[PDB]
Amino acid sequence: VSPPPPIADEPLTVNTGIYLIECYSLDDKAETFKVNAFLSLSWKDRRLAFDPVRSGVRVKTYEPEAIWIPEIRFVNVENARDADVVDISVSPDGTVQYLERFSARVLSPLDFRRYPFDSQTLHIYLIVRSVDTRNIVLAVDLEKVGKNDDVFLTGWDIESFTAVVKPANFALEDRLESKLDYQLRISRQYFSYIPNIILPMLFILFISWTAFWSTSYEANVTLVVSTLIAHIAFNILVETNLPKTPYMTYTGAIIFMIYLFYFVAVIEVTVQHYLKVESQPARAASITRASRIAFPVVFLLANIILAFLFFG
Amino acid sequence: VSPPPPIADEPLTVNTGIYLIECYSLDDKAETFKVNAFLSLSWKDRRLAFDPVRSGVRVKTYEPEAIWIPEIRFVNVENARDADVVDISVSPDGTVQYLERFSARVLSPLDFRRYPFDSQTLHIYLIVRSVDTRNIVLAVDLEKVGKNDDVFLTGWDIESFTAVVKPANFALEDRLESKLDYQLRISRQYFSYIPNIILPMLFILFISWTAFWSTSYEANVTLVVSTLIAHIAFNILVETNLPKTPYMTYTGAIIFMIYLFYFVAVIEVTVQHYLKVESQPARAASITRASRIAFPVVFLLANIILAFLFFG
Amino acid sequence: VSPPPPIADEPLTVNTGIYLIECYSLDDKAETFKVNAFLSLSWKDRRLAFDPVRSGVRVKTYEPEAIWIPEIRFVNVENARDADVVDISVSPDGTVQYLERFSARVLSPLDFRRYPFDSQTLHIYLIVRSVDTRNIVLAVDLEKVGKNDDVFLTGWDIESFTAVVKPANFALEDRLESKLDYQLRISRQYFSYIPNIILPMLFILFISWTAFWSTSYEANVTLVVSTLIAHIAFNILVETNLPKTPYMTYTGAIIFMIYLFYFVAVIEVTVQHYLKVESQPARAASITRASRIAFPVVFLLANIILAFLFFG
Amino acid sequence: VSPPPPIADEPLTVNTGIYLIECYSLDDKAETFKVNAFLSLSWKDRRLAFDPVRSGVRVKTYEPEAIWIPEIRFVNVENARDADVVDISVSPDGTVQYLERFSARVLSPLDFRRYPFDSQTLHIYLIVRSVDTRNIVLAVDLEKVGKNDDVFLTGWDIESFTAVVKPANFALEDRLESKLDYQLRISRQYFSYIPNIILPMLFILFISWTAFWSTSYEANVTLVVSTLIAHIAFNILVETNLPKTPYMTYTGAIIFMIYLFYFVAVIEVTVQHYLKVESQPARAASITRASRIAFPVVFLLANIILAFLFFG
Amino acid sequence: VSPPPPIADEPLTVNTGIYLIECYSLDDKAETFKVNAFLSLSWKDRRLAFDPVRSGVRVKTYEPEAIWIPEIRFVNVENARDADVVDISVSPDGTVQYLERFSARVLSPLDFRRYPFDSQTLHIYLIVRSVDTRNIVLAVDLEKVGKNDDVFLTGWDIESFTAVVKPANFALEDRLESKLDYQLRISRQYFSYIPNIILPMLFILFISWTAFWSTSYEANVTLVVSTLIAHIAFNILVETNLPKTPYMTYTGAIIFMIYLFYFVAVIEVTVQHYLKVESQPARAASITRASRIAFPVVFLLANIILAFLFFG
Ligand SMILES: [Cl-]
Ligand SMILES: [Cl-]
Ligand SMILES: [Cl-]
Ligand SMILES: [Cl-]
Ligand SMILES: [Cl-]
């Protein structure tokens, strides 16, 4: 109803704390996730002080109305959180303990430069706006920050959930505001990617390469082109789940490299057939024997160079 | 309006019970499901006692306001439940009878190690938070727990719906809480999977294997590569549904084994043609004669070993 | 405000009636549909009887509040209905007339044993709970049950919309309840399935069979395997719509039969080539000539037997 | 608060009008579209009359409450419209002006007998129910019916938006009601369907037909079968957008014709090879030469006949 | 709740300014996007002026009630905005400062004529409605127009965010109306489209063109038709992330030209074989060696013509 008047000019400090209960629905393309947690607040209000002995009580309980509650808002949320007050209590000296449970949908960008083996950081921002009569700043209560042991994300491993103690103060629309940053660090579970994507791709590439041990043109054409079709199908399957980015990723580089290898293999088969038709089997044999060793070695070297370039 | 005052120090016991009406929309990828049921509560409040003869009635009826109702919440839910009050009744001694119908969406992890033939357990958690003046604990009323005869889940057989009668008491946010566990056990209906997935795969594999009775290189290449493409399409269709897990499952192992078999078949065809083109037909005949028996036997042994290793 | 007291022991009867306006969005996979209709209720209340001559009116109008209105609920709904009251009228003798318009989503199982040519029956259940002082039952008013001539479902034909007059009375949660059943009978529009699915599949099967008039092994292999791939694509397209069931259907049986036929055709082609290579070009000719007649006759007999089994 | 009393028996007249602002999301399969428009009403209430000279004003503004506003509903909507009141004004003689902005989702059937080149009419129905003391009818005010110049429908051309002047008075649920019809006429933009769907299909068909200038059986088999597979893929793509209908459309007829043509082409290739193997080259040459001319002419004639049938 | 006093004859001017916070969910299918931003207002009221020394205060803080605030809405929104008032303050003069936060779903047309390399402009329209007693106009405050540094859209770059100073005044529904225009210029990030789309397509086309260096008819048929199948599959891959619009875009022209080139290549191969089978090798050799040069040059010239036509 009315913010507590200051003594002389001191600001009002509000202690915050978030306790995660459930987190779920991490969408890569939409770059969002949903959360379910507690919100804890604590400040000072001398007007509500009382004598414990006179009143015969040690804790008083107030309804959300008929009491001043600061307005805390999340910055990067799609809609205002749906919340419900759990409990409000007042201490004899004037300290107020506030608790509520909410749910919200949070927007946060993701970095996909190492997509199969990447780690991400998700941010939650709290802000408060100063009133025309009092200045309000935020702080962090280290005891009230935490998460449940049952919190799970489908496909991710949760590492930590901390908060930066120092807030950021800035002027927005001729008023002063304070901001807090809560960080949740997660890592991707990449085990399922190996036997479901990587190994079949290598098998198909080897089946394509086995055409350097034959001399029949039609069989070579069939092998190479059909393996190319299989590669296109796998590429569609993989790309349906990876969002478009303005930079170069590991997976895209590997896929482009495989396309280039298929093109060069077709070129080699055509060259060998053309040489053999003109009655020059010696050059064709030399080229084929050279390619048999040239292709895997260059593939391995290029893969090693790419790994050093993206993880070094 | 105010919790009942204790006689001397005793905690308040609230008897609960859930009666299922509808359960539906089990999402394997999101690991969620939707529920629709009754919620029953009963506690003791001596402030509402009355004299039957003086009043002339047997049971009174109050509105949800101007009466104290304990705050019960679900832990693993996406949002607060949609509630409505059905009936409130008070006995002459003071016992209160409460009834309510709700609906919610519940989060619960799943285990996919035996995906076609797996059985799951779904959990619902009830919690109550103690007030600053009284201690509250939960209890189970066995005569109020059950389900309808028409409760059906598309694709699952429902086996039982019970509750663990021992609650868990702990501290959180400087208060004591009590939690209850309700367990629903289901089994997947695996009949449709056999003639839709398992047998076409075997027929395609046998069609691929029929290439050990031939000597034409082009026909063998066409057979094997076309069957491989069909296998890839089937694998994509299967994987569209099953999610990604940090552990190996039965279906993934089988699919990887089939990929390995196709690779070895291509190698065998290439080796046979290479040996024949060098005017060594006896060795090629010996190798293909061995392969005709070697492939199905090793396949059968591999599936027997995998089935023992995953289900025993 | 309070249920009307009885005379001695008579129960309270409520006359119901549902008039369909819009029914739409029948999902086969979820087995749900959406409805929009009118709900009519009528009962007796002697506490509201008035003298028409004194009042000067033939009918009195009341608000939804300030008058006791029984609570009627739908059993098989995902959420509570969204309703708005249209009018309330009271006759001088005390009979109360009620009206409202609602919209809800109804859960109802379906049977797919004859999927292309099946018929269904959708159920809507109405229930009422007895108050402690009065016992309430339900009755059907045949003069207020019907549907608009413009009620249309996409892909279905509507036959009738009736109600079962006899209510089912039982006990639930220490109270007596009455239940009514409204049945909507529909049939499927199967014309679009024939030229879109059935005929192309037969054409592809005949194209596959055309290989019994040829002796070129490579051409036969190409024909049979490519037609198998086309069959797989069509099967995936069909399977995207029909959900999984714990029993066998007509379409699944036909698809499995086609897979078996393709396998046998591949075996026959391989056998003919093998016998020709061994320099016995008479048994191969006999087998091919036999198969030319054997395949269509067996296909026709099997289709007749399956059609008799599923629709007889 | 109460319907105005008549002079002797005349019905109350309400004048309506709809001004379109937005129209979007026209779903072919669901047969729904979304709207955003102003709603205008005007009636007569003599009890609100005042003398402007004594009052000192020319227009009096009333809150939506404490005044009688007629209940107007939309018949073919999924849910009740979401609206807010804009302005209410009363003329000195008693005439009331009312304005409101709403949004709704409408249901309307569609016709697909000429799917690429079809024209549709969308209906919006307004209804009102008579009260027990007064009779209400609806009229049309042509000065308040129209649409914005920024109204755009993705894929359609908006032609006109009018209202049928004569309402439909009928008795429903023992009460007389009046209904109005608003019609919006749209036409489909078919240009993008030509180069994206139509011409590639012709190119693939001609590629299939080019096999009448060769005598190599394997090449002809490969050509025809692979082009059939490509046709199947397009057909799936095209079908994934057009809903199933209980009648026959133009596109389905063309697609079935293409399937028939592929079947007959395969038959011709088989016949030619069989005749050539039997040392009868003259008949095979004559048949191939005849087919070279026969196929395109019959295709063109069938297309002309179908176009005449579906557009004449 | 009183409109500000009109001093002689003058309209009321309101200074508006929108400060962006979040932008997300830009759907090209429905041409919609969600926004989250501030809204600043400022106008004048004679009565609210108060003496500073008499009160010993600088600025007051009025509730939404007991004060008059102009109603301002957005033309292009599916539903009304969800707003919560943040701060209302009054200077020592009659000037009032108003602030609020809102979220909305905006409808704005999109253009994809240059789809990969296109730029779009998003519009937000602010409108105030005049009352029967006072005229209202809208102004623009440049110090309140801004955009956060953390505003991001998935796959787009944000160029600028300004407003058009000049309103548009027009009469609608017998009332004078004023409008404002806020424009947000964006451009699409096209880097990822080169290695994902452009280069694989070129590789496939070159693989198809490699058939001008061979004589084997079967190999040429296999190459060209299988590359056509790969082209159709990659068309599916491209179309999976392209809005379904009735447009004549750059991509559609490219794909149609590719289809034409495939058709002409098939025609050339057929002509070469047909000439060769009649013992005219010189003409076939000449045609092949001419096509080797003709195809790429014509392809490049057509590409240049299309690029100059669409981007000129
Ligand atoms: Cl918030
Ligand atoms: Cl809850
Ligand atoms: Cl209900
Ligand atoms: Cl409505
Ligand atoms: Cl708004």
Quickly describe the structure.
The structure is a homopentamer of 312-residue chains. Chain A is of the alpha+beta class and 312 residues long.
List keywords for this structure.
homopentamer; 312 residues; alpha+beta; Acetylcholine Binding Protein, Chain: A; Methane Monooxygenase Hydroxylase, Chain G, domain 1; 2 domains; 7-stranded mixed β-sheet; 5-stranded antiparallel β-sheet; 5 helices; binds chloride ion; membrane protein; pentameric ligand-gated ion channels; cis-loop
CATH classification class of the largest domain in chain A: Mainly Beta
CATH topology of the largest domain in chain A: Acetylcholine Binding Protein, Chain: A
Into which percentage range does the β-strand content of chain A fall?
25-35%
User: Biggest interface in this structure?
Assistant: A-E, 51 and 55 residues
What is the straight-line distance between the termini of chain A? 58 Å
What share of the residues of chain A lie within helices? 25-40%
Structurally, the number of domains of chain A stands at 2
Identify every distinct bound molecule in the structure, by name, code or SMILES. Answer: chloride ion
Number of helices of chain A: 5
The CATH superfamily of the largest domain in chain A turns out to be: Neurotransmitter-gated ion-channel ligand-binding domain
- Describe the main β-sheet of chain A briefly: 7 strands, mixed
Q: Identify the overall geometry of chain A.
A: rod-shaped
What's the order of the H and E elements of chain A?
Answer: EEHEEEEEEEEEEHHHH
Structural class of chain A: alpha+beta
Oligomeric composition of the shown chains: homopentamer
Subcellular location (chains A, B, C, D, E): Cell inner membrane
Family (chains A, B, C, D, E): Belongs to the ligand-gated ion channel (TC 1.A.9) family.
Main location (chains A, B, C, D, E): membrane
Pfam family, one (chains A, B, C, D, E): Neur_chan_LBD
